[PDB]
Amino acid sequence: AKSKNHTAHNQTRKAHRNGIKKPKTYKYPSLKGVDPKFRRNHKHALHGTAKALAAAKK
Template sequence: MAKSKNHTNHNQNRKAHRNGIKKPKKQRFMSMKGVDPKFLKNLRFAKKHNKRHTVKNESSA
């Protein structure tokens, strides 16, 4: 009995390039879905209070 074929990559490269190999679409901000809720709550407060200090510094300058 003849040995069976174990592996081939024939034609796969041509098939992949017919429509072009595209990079994944990048979004401006990553999704926070599935992130630790305690961390997210702290992140919100940090952003909020960070804005408050920048406004104070701009008015004094």
């Protein structure tokens, strides 16, 4: 016995019952796919900046 194959009927209503939520943007986003050379140098730059700011708090 054949049946229905596909429909998007009621799917938008289901999605909008709990709403379509924007993905909660954060400051300082993740560096997941950032160029690893840039990331490697960024780690040393931030380390040097932290050490400079610590030494300069007199």
